[PDB]
Ligand binder design. Structure first.
Ligand SMILES: [Zn+2]
Lengths: 86, 135, 244
RNA sequence: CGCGACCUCAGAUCAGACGUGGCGACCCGCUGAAUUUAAGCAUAUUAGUCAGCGGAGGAGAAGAAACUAACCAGGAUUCCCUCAGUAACGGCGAGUGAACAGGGAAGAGCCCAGCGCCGAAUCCCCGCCCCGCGGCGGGGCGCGGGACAUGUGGCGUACGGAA
RNA sequence: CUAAGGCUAAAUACCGGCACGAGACCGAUAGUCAACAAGUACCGUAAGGGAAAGUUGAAAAGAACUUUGAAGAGAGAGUUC
RNA sequence: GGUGGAGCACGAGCGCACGUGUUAGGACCCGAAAGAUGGUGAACUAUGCCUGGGCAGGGCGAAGCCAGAGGAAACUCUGGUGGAGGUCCGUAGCGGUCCUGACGUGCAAAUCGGUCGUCCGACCUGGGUAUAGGGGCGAAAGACUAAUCGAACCAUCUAGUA
RNA sequence: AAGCCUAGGGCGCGGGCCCGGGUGGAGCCGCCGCAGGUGCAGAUCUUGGUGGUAGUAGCAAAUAUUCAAACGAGAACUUUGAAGGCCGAAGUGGAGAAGGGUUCCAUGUGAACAGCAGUUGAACAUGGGUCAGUCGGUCCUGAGAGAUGGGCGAGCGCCGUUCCGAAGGGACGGGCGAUGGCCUCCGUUGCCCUCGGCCGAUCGAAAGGGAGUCGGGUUCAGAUCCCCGAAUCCGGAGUGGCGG
RNA sequence: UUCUUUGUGAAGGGCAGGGCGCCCUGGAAUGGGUUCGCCCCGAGAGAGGGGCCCGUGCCUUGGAAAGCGUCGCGGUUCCGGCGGCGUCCGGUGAGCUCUCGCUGGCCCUUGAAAAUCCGGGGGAGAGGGUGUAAAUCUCGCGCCGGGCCGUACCCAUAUCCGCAGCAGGUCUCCAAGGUGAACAGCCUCUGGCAUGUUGGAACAAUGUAGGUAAGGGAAGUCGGCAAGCCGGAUCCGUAACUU
RNA sequence: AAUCCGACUGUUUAAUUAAAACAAAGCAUCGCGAAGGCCCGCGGCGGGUGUUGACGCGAUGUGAUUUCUGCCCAGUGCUCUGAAUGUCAAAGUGAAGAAAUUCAAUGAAGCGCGGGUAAACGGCGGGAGUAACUAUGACUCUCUUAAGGUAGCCAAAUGCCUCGUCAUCUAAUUAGUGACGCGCAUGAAUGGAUGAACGAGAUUCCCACUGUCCCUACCUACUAUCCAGCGAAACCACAGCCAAGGGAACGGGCUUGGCGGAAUCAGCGGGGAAAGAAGACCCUGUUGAGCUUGACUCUAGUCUGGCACGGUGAAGAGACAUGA
RNA sequence: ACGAUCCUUCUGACCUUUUGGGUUUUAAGCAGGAGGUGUCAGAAAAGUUACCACAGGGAUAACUGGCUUGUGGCGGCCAAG
RNA sequence: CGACUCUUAGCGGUGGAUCACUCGGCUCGUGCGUCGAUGAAGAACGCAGCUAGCUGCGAGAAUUAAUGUGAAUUGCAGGACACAUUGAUCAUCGACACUUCGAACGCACUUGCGGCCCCGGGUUCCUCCCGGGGCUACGCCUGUCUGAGCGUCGCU
RNA sequence: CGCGGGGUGGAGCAGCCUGGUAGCUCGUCGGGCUCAUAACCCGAAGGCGUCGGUUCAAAUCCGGCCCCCGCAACCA
């Protein structure tokens, strides 16, 4: 009765949506993540999984702030100046 | 010393690595005092430390810390070198005197290692096989 | 081999005490001026039953001689303690059943229980269900006292500690046998998970040093030395003799 | 039985700043094996390598001898060639294995404590005036405060230095 | 030579990122897993695993309109070399 | 005068390129039982704790109690009441003995039919929680640990060696 | 042009090669040397496609369907009416918790799925639908988890929940001073005197504790939630809004 | 004559009806009172008289206006209509379920914490002087507000987990009538459905699931395996052994 | 009506073994008075037992009741004391040398030595003499290593010979039951003998009962048959009629003969050395894994000694030395 | 009638080095002998698996089949009885 | 002749092999070499007239402002603009803005509870209530303030 | 490999640390005792593992060898 009849009593869950990595890996009982390690200050990463490092790296997401830094870098980091008006 | 952080036995392998009691930590204990001072106070930077007493169970050290952003050091030409971001956490990288002695670096035949950049760089040059264009 | 049982009891989390329904710790009063020089009077309000313990507890209420409150204590009831009986506590208190007073002061030969081992830790010795301690002799110099413990060993202790006079109520508990597995199952259910003891011979040899073989036999001397490691100190631990 | 200094130790939604985390190809400091070989295997080898931890930078580290040499002597550190698969290590087995010198790329030296001498001659912060302020600076005015004699600043560091 | 104090660019490394250049390299079962809405769909509770999938035509000019069938589907007609 | 040497006895090497053969490197290609490092799992199951829920109808008839009779007290019999049970038949529930039935590319990677054990306490079960791999847990079968257990799974060493 | 097909013509022992015809529409070949990821029949080879088996096994667990009408092009399976049945209140019923997440309701389609069919569906395309002081969560704590102090650890961090701790920021009354509204009064905040513990931050149950809503009606799909009508609980009130 | 229907919420008041280990008089053996059982009594029994709690039961405001069952009309309809009436009297039962209360038995099992609320001991303090105040664990009435999230549907032989519309598994509420000890099995009512991934035609073998067999009764088979016998209730009767 | 086992209720290998297995109340031990016993933890003034204190905690063996539990400490363990002292490391001390170095004394714990313990692991034989037939031995002596199986029990779940011998059960019994013991190799908490109740436990016999059979036969439902519709999968070098011969030692193909005729349907299990799975029974590998110990190296833990944290005072005592 | 490398021990030279020069102790060498590898051209090495696994082998057993018939069974020839 | 079966050829089906293309990868080389409490990386949720996915953007949400350029975007409608006007679209981008979680920062993650000030409705502060804004995390440096000590001292 | 100890009539124990007699039991030949047996008491054999030396003189104190076990030890 360890097979099909044992799959029927799977009602409660152990993991939910994490609020730092977004993946369904936040363990309810231990009150911790482990795709990213939410209660730990540092993001969980490991070098023995090279594919998992590139799944969520710097180049993956939106660059909602960093692409401006790259764009401002070639322009000279000027502030407070405006182009000469007509 | 340093007891090996493994359970009761559980040192699976060849009989060389079965020792856990009589193991000595490669870095000096005084450098550990510098390491812990900067770990707790990440805003300041350690210059050096010195010995102020010991017990059979404890060793006491006094570590000098420098405010990088205080205007007394920041405007002093002799001491504003530490304000540079190159010297960020010298205690972590073994740049103080207590950490410099643990690296085994120096001049002459007495060492014959650390002859590149550091001990790791000395191992690198002797192990990278140089293949030219023409060989 | 894997970790044997008993060795697993040191980590806990399955073998910890069931302290949910227990009503507190059975301790004496703390030392102060009134207890050291005179006596203080308490009232036994009611007697309760502590789960996992074979002795009833007497709920004794004292008044604090410093600030206006009533202090509730957890006294182990002596045999003969009833509700509303005045219980005295101190050096000047008289000698009767249910009256704690220092060991250096009563004449030797009394019957005391809930004996204090070190002066100021509120009673440790001879307080299980019906055991008691007897005093052999006193010593005015060095303030020592020889007291016979229920195990039969005589220990020379200080004369400044105290015990409550009498025997522990609830004697003869082991006189009636259990007669069932269920009454034994319910007995240790209040205490801890240690009742279903599987003998090590029938167990497989990876869980026990005595298991294995085609016959249910030990195969090795069951008397094991005192300095044996964990997982090997199993059986007769440093036995001086083995027979009758 | 208090007041007033000093030393140690606190509370601040005190005034003003600072660190956390990420990336991590290169680097630094630790910790750190077993596959594999030795036709087995335990020293050895894999290997101070994989993994784990911390730390920054655009480079890092190292760096101006408690050096190499025994020469008619060279002279910080870093990288290439060569020494060299050499001296040496190794159940002297498998295998491991540098360094000096020489030719080059580059080449830059210095600062403290102490010893001393100068009236603390020094430094930090708050208020006012002038200048420019979108990498908060320069000058002047303040019995305006603080740090400092349990030592700040100038001369001065082994190539001698000071008077 | 002068240790038990400290600073110091250059010759050095760079499979990450930005912007490029080049190729006796592979040409859609090859080349990065991914030439395409690819770390996407999907699988496992989770750590993680992880695809397949390029091509109308110069230009849609993508078949107006007649007829059978309810329609899918046809016969004609028409466009394009 | 004998003897050992990879020697001299009027050079023949250096550089480049190709082929053959050997060795080390993944080494002509594919293939293990293994070992180590770091992480993920008690939603199945194993056990403990906390908080809740449930377990028809009958059989036997313990203590205690009442009445009567017999007697010399001692006391003893008879008829009632009573409802005790790790009691019994038996339903729901829990589980799976036998037919080694059905099926056995099945309804199903373990189900179905009849016949079964128990069914008031060592009973069953929901939710929360704790114990994590040479570890846990085990009324003990090397059982269970997410269809995997005489050492789980995931990734790396690793294209491990043969 | 490449590529592909060929009952055509042939060459070379052979590896293979040259022409003829057809499709095709855009690049390709010979010689001298150079270089390689260079030649397949197998590896219980990998990927993809297709056969015999084969229109075969099969569409058989739980008693059962029949007649007439409607829609339509089409009816054994849809709907309606009638008959006969079954589940038999520990149900094939009426409602929930976990889980599912639009699957709930109306209209339309029948391209693909519902291992036959379907005018039908939990399929598809359009839209719509969940209304709370009183129902729950929110609050409390249990088993337990988990910071600060403390200790350990090379280290990410680990141990532990009262243990090596200056762990209260609260409150009554009085004094000093001030503002606020008709500084008479009340109110506000700062300091001083005074009092003071309680066992420790915090999390932890939609089945534990937990104040207080019921009746009728209403929608295609929501109703102790919307409307109607009756109540009830908590908090506030300075000038107290009124009476007793 | 057979079937359906025949009633009143929450919130308050009153009265039934239960419970008291609550009180006053009085003091009892010739012992008394009393339950299924118990049990109680000079530490106060009976007998009288009172007091308190639950009152979910009845009546009352709600509240007959509304709801329901019939009959007849209005609006073509679009309408939450308009009227006539009725919604009555009683008794039972070891009846089934729920709830309240009393009592008894068992434990080497004694059967949770906290938030929050309430009562009491005290008198630190307050107010007013002969018409008024401070007070009102708020006596009655009155005003304002109660903020955030879920609320649809399934909850299982088709909406969950098993690769699926899978005979598997999954925690709970209610439970009609008859027969019958029974919430057992069978039939019927309310409610639900089309027989469970299809139908038609024949009734071959071999099958799966049910049955029956003259005579023998285990001779079959490793083996009474399977199948079969008895079976409920009432009246008798009941052995060896034994803790 | 009996035999065996387990007392019993209960639990156990989810997915081949529900039991005689585990557990269980009872019985008998061992350690521990808290700076302790057992154990966890890399670590800490850490943690579980412990909100605990010998009627307790932790580790054991046996398995209800009744009765009994005999002998053996030689061996391996465990434990006790001990200057009665063989061995014994580091550190310290003395001597020699220019010094590294060497030698000597001292020399802890533990091993040895000496006691205890078998409800610790365990074991419980011969030989020889010996009673008025023989036989046998009530009795006496010896070892190997310490005694040599006591009470009881059985051809058992334990007996190779074996289907041991006798009685019963049957017409017939390698089965069962009841006795004998010489027992390859029964046996006393590795528990022996019993034993009321009970067991989805393992066997023998009797009554009733029946298709288990003699000996099969008939009926019903759903399949299987055909048809409407939809419709796979395993497997497949090629395919498929045999006798003999040889072959690689058993042919569908080769040879010699027999001979053979489209396409099929429903059964059927003779073959296709049928399919399902690189046999797990055996062996090899200088391939592993689990477990054990008297295997070889180690190690956690634990005991002992020294150094440092480690201060103060007073006596005594051992050696050396001075030395009559 | 007996034993390679490495290691150790001993013996010998007015023997070499002991790495800046000199002396001594010590140590490393050169040559010879010995301390042994009996698996004897020389690893340092106890068992069990019925809980087992992997790569293979018909180079190799446990069936049948194939050769032979020791043995078993069967049938003969001579003839002392 | 038939029906069935085999080979070959033509044609028509299943299938997407070969060939030629390629806004893509791999390798090497050069320059620079820049994250974040003024809130990084990442994640969640929203934003177009008709918008599912990709990309872009953040309640100013298919982009705002400015500079350069100069008649378009476009799948379909629409309407701005006169391109004789900073003017449609694009690139640059130096100004402004940037929801929630997240080192994540008032306490914990249920999106629930807090407190201290200011402002507007309540009110004409007199306390509730509502809405908006600014604060309230840890570690640590300098300085300030208030303190503690049978620490060392003087005054008394 | 270096610290120890012990070998004894036909058989089991001393005498050894300190040299002066090889002894004590048990088996054997006998003698006594009691009326006799039994028991008991007595006389007799037959021997310091081996070599050498110090010494008035050895089993004894010494050194070396054959047979054992106590330990601690281990790179051809
Ligand atoms: Zn996460």
């Amino acid at each position: 009765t360890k097979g099909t009849s044992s799959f029927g009593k799977r009602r409660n869950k152990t993991h939910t949506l994490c609020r730092r990595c977004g993946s369904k890996a936040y363990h309810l009982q231990k009150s911790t993540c482990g795709k990213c390690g939410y209660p730990a200050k540092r993001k969980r990463k490991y070098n023995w999984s090279a594919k998992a490092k590139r799944r969520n790296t710097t180049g993956t997401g939106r660059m909602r702030h960093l692409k401006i830094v790259y764009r401002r870098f070639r322009h000279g980091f000027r502030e407070g100046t405006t182009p000469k008006p007509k | 010393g340093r007891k090996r952080p493994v359970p009761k036995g559980a040192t699976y392998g060849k009989p060389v690595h079965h020792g856990v009691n009589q193991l000595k930590f490669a870095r000096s204990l005084q450098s550990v005092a510098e390491e812990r001072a900067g770990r707790h106070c990440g805003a300041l930077r350690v210059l050096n430390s010195y010995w102020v007493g010991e017990d059979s169970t404890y060793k006491f050290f006094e570590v000098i810390l420098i405010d990088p952003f205080h205007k007394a050091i920041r405007r002093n030409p002799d001491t504003q070198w530490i304000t540079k971001p190159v010297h960020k956490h010298r205690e972590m990288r073994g740049l103080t005197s207590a950490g410099r002695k643990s690296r085994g670096l120096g001049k002459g035949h007495k060492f014959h290692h650390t002859i590149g950049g550091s001990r790791r760089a000395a191992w690198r040059r002797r192990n990278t096989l140089q293949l030219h264009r023409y060989r | 081999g894997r970790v044997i049982r008993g060795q697993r009891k040191g980590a806990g989390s399955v073998f910890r005490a069931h302290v949910k329904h227990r009503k507190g710790a059975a301790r004496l009063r703390a030392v102060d001026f009134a207890e050291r020089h005179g006596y203080i009077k308490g009232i036994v309000k009611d007697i309760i039953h502590d789960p996992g313990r074979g002795a009833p507890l007497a709920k004794v209420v004292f008044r604090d001689p410093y600030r206006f409150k009533k202090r509730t204590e957890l006294f182990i009831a002596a045999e003969g303690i009833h509700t509303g009986q005045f219980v005295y506590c101190g050096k000047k208190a008289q000698l009767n059943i249910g009256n704690v007073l220092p060991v250096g002061t009563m004449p030797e030969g009394t019957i005391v229980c809930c004996l204090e081992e070190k002066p100021g830790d509120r009673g440790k010795l001879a307080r299980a269900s019906g055991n008691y301690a007897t005093v052999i002799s006193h010593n005015p110099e060095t303030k020592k006292t020889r007291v016979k413990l229920p195990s039969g060993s005589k220990k020379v202790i200080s004369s400044a500690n105290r015990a409550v006079v009498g025997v522990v109520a609830g004697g003869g508990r082991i006189d009636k046998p259990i007669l069932k597995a269920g009454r034994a199952y319910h007995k240790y259910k209040a205490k801890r998970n240690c009742w279903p003891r599987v003998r090590g011979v029938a167990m497989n040899p990876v869980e026990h040093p005595f298991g294995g073989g085609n016959h249910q036999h030990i195969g090795k001397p069951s008397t094991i030395r005192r300095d044996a490691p964990a997982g090997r100190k199993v059986g007769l631990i440093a036995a001086r003799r083995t027979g009758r």
